[PDB]
Design a binder for this molecule. Sequence first.
Ligand SMILES: Cc1nc(NC(=O)N2CCC[C@H]2C(N)=O)sc1-c1ccnc(C(C)(C)C(F)(F)F)c1
Lengths: 227, 999
Amino acid sequence: EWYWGDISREEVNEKLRDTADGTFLVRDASTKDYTLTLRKGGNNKLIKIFHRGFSDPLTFKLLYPVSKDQVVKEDNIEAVGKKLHEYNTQFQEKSREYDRLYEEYTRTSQEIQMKRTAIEAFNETIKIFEEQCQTQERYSKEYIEKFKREGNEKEIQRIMHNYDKLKSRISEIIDSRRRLEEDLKKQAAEYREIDKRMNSIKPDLIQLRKTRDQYLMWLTQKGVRQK
Amino acid sequence: PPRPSSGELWGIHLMPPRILVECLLPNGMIVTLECLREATLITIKHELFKEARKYPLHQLLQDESSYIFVSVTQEAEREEFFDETRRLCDLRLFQPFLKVIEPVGNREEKILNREIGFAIGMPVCEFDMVKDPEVQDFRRNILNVCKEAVDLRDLNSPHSRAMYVYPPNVESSPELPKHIYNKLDKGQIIVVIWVIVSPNNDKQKYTLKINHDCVPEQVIAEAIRKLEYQGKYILKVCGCDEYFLEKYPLSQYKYIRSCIMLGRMPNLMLMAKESLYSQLPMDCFTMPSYSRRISTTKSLWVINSALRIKILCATYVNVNIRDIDKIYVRTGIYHGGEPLCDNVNTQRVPCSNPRWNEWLNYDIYIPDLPRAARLCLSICSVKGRKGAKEEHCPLAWGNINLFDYTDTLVSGKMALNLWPVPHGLEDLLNPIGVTGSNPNKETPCLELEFDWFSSVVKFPDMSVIEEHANENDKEQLKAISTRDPLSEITEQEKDFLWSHRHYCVTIPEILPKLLLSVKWNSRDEVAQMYCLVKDWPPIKPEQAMELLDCNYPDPMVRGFAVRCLEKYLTDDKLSQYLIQLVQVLKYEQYLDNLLVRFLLKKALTNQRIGHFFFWHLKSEMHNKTVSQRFGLLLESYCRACGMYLKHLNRQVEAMEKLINLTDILKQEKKDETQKVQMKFLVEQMRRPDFMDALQGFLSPLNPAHQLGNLRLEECRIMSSAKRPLWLNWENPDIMSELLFQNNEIIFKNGDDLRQDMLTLQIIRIMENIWQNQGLDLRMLPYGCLSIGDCVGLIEVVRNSHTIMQIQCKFNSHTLHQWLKDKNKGEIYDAAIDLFTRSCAGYCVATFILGIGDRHNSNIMVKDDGQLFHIDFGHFLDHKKKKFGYKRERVPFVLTQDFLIVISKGAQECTKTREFERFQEMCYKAYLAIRQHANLFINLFSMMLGSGMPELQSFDDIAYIRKTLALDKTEQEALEYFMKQMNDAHHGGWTTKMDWIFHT
Ligand SMILES: Cc1nc(NC(=O)N2CCC[C@H]2C(N)=O)sc1-c1ccnc(C(C)(C)C(F)(F)F)c1
């Protein structure tokens, strides 16, 4: 049965979402008498049914109809209510788990970006320090030659001591970069695992909400009506 | 890239008092120098060159003055430090090292590029790297806007310079609402004009009784009386940097309008024109180097074939192989949020092997593709484990423009880096999302192949497009034109609107509905729509704004909207809707468009606009979806804003110090007590680098507010979990005692303030509608500004306390007794009236918007009785997903405590004449917003791509359609509001007559 009563345009959109051409359902007008919604070219077409159909004189293709699958399979209100409580409990727990997973996903994605920027800064720093070695080498050669021929042993040792200081600093910066690259490699793997966990929880969270909402709708239907 | 943190070194928030700095001399020597953390580069350089004499090859060193330092910053940039007055702790160094070099290249250009890079949070040199010709074309072409604005600023100097820096803060119309004009004594205002008499700067008081519509010059003329003089002076608001430089009626100036309204005395200050004119620096713009560099066919309508796209492979996906069955590529061809044909999927393939090599054929003829056509795609997962039931979920999405910025149809091979799926988005495709590849290349990369037609295919020229090539209905068109932007439009109405398209011109405001009636997948209908748009009469700016949202992607349609804004949008309204106008830039297909040119021009011709334009763009620089676009835009703004760049850099650096200080408290010092944290706070704040940066700058909440010296004894870390900083500065204005002496701001690092910013803006717009209709419902839309990723500023409302604070100082009468004690005798009635009026405004606004539930800690009351809400946090149907109930909540339920105040302590509160009057205020406020429903729906629609989780689709906006009962009659809508109030308060809400709604 394609007739769906007092359901909103947004409820129809959810029911016609990603459906094939020809999918339809007739509902009460959003306040005006009945609205026919037809799926055509990836869009939901609204066709009014005037009463006094939609032609010039009211002489009172639609292939697949959205019918009113029973997700709820219980006899009484007590069993339905007990099941709604179970599904709502699982839903709130899974929603809280997903929120926690999303915060860790964001934190990991942000820290990955910080580490990537720091690696580029390490690369630029190492270059500068290597350029410094090269500068020391270009100048040192002519002066080392002179002090050796002159006989100043302590002076060549001073030039050598400073060059050793420069090389040990370069080695320390290189090792700091290597350690950062390792932490990034391990965090990039942690990210993929968090993305995987979230890709598994998302479909299950959506199905759980839909079932909860269905049991809520059943309880509303069976309970005392009018407002 | 942007700085990882706001720390003084990588992995170190603060440098210790003394630090070893590795200094790299130009002779190849390395000197380790122990430096004080706050030491300037001139000091460090002098200390280094003295020490360098004790090292070999010192003879190769030129004079100390011949060199500057260079180092790697936390942005991975090699920065040359030309400004040697800067402190070591403020250099944003990656590591404690400095390299000694001789200054080379264009010094002036390098200095300005550094200043721009600092303001924007990214080095400008990163833009020169970018290979995309659209990017390089934007950087060059936008400079015409920069040039146009700067010339227009120096055109009538110094008045035009004064009008730029200090624009008139005026209302959109000089017309006075009834209740406001009646507050005047026969259309006359009593104003106090102050004069700073030199040489001892004494304050002289002059009380003037003049007409409200008296232009500033006329106000001066009267001050003289109580010839030569009238023209040599200017008026300024006492206590702030707001000036009356334009010939507007005095009452049209917001400060004066607000003074009449509040029954307050306007305190103005008269000063000489030259005293301000001299202080204005002559702004100079210079053409950048990139504007002087050597850079680096068939029609669509003749291509006789249907649309087809090949999906090759994806590098990878992050899925648990045991949880998902298959993966596939979902695609769609969109014009805005509307598909132009049915979505097409590839075949399902294993999770471990993302390879399709499939041509997807689309139900669209290539010549029928509109100009704004886009390919929207995603990699989806499918889980089919229960019955025949399947769960489809997106893994990563990406969108591309089918035509580039030069009107070229996409061809050949293309690699697209996909984006993570936004939190809460369950739709398989993301058509509202930005276009282009993810700059992060460590993401799934989808390989695509577009068709080749033995040449370059170009969208037809406008001349080609203008090919021509061919009583009760009047009431129906008037009815359709008055409906809300999200109201249902039937196919019969679409056909009806398209049939009467030439007559639609008589009712110009029908254009948005007519554009949705067009078949965008037909070149015959679009060409006809284009001819109508060209000659379409201009619509109101508030109506034109709708044509800038994600539903109207057509460049001609968007072009029409911009022209209406250029001609009719006032600076007042542009400042009011700036948040929305910055956001709709994200929907633009290209970097260069008419909207970006219009906004940049306005930002560069009015500093009030420029200030918020800069901060709204800056606040999103962390977001990679808009980072490049906003960075390029901010660069062009900073290059031409003149002297304001220096004021903005002072705000940026003060904010960075606050981010760093709060990061320390929230990270390293998290487990320490409030007492220990407070000791660290006072000590750190007293350092010269902190005192220099946090004193003497402009408030980012209001640039007319000067932040002088800090009142450290009033600064504190608040008890909340995110460690908010309560800050207090002196107002250094010479007449601060007449406005406020203390400027108090809460700095919060940790919460997303974007939703609160939007709610506070909506509240301000509602209050303005109410005032302009004779409804004095006083709201308190306090200042709130997001300055970055979950970081922002909140304006403190002084002399206000939460309900809980009042109660803890109880029974249902405590609140009323408290107000009685604060407002004794003859001022009591005014307090009750203000509480009642403010209650009514908050009751209606919160019900319409569906904000987070009110309680004693998020409701505040001022000493004078003004009630207001704080911490909005949530809005719209935020409880729908969580509990699945279909209801419109009443977040602000007026409990007995509120009813006792309104009724002045009466036994039966709801039976009073006070409550009847309160109800009437609510009813009138509600209907006034309902009448302006289009504006609010449009404001929310312009925010859909903002990334706020509670505003993701047009279906989220549907909530306001329900609270405003837009599908019902005005009478039914009022009955609905009353029923909602009666259900929430358990009766008490009445009206006059049920059948016709006549008293
Ligand atoms: C507009 C405003 N005005 C205030 N004023 C006072 O708190 N006062 C003013 C008097 C003393 C003090 C008090 N009541 O104790 S608090 C406030 C406010 C607005 C919005 N959010 C907040 C917080 C605390 C949730 C945030 F975001 F900062 F963390 C505060």
